[PDB]
Amino acid sequence: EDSIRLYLQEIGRIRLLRADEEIELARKIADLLELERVRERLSEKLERDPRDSEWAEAVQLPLPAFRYRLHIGRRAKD
DNA sequence: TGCAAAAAACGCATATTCTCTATGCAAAAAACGCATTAATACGAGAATTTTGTAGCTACTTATACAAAATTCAGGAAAATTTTTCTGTATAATGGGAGCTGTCACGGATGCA
């Protein structure tokens, strides 16, 4: 009869996964920083964002391939 | 304790006489008339004269334009206070607080 308990009760078991993945995340920490940071630097030069996936990265990036950078880089910071 | 009865008083004979009711005297008030003088008012004269009426004149104001010399309402800076946002780096690893003595009712489920 409790959502606080819920928090327990499903995350009391959640751990910290140590601080090793910090760098594994670091790779992504950036990478995301990038992926956006570009993509809005590119908002910001023009089109206020063409809503284009490739522009989601200043460097080239095959759609699915870069789709793996995000989502993976995201679960990293998730 | 009945009166018969005597002397002096107390009652039928007038002087006295003395408050007393009664008219003429007289003296000064008063008020009436002779009346005299003065004053209260009528007659005339022309003098002031204020009020009543006209026109001129000076003051006072009816009015028509408006920016006087001053008031105010925003507009846009500061000025300082205050508000919202962002940031500060050891480790820290499952939450307390009453419900347990109410009676009775009406469904609504579970549990063989």
Spell out where chain A has E strands: none
Triad A72, A32, A38: Cα angle to 5°: 140
CA→C1' distance for A13 and B23 (Å): 179
Q: Residues 6 or more apart from A54 whose CB is under 8 A from it?
A: A60, A61, A63
C1’ B5 / CA A37, Å: 198
Q: Which residues touch strand B (CB under 7 A)?
A: A 2, 4-5, 8, 12-13, 16
Q: Quick check: A26 and A34 in contact, CB under 8 A?
A: no
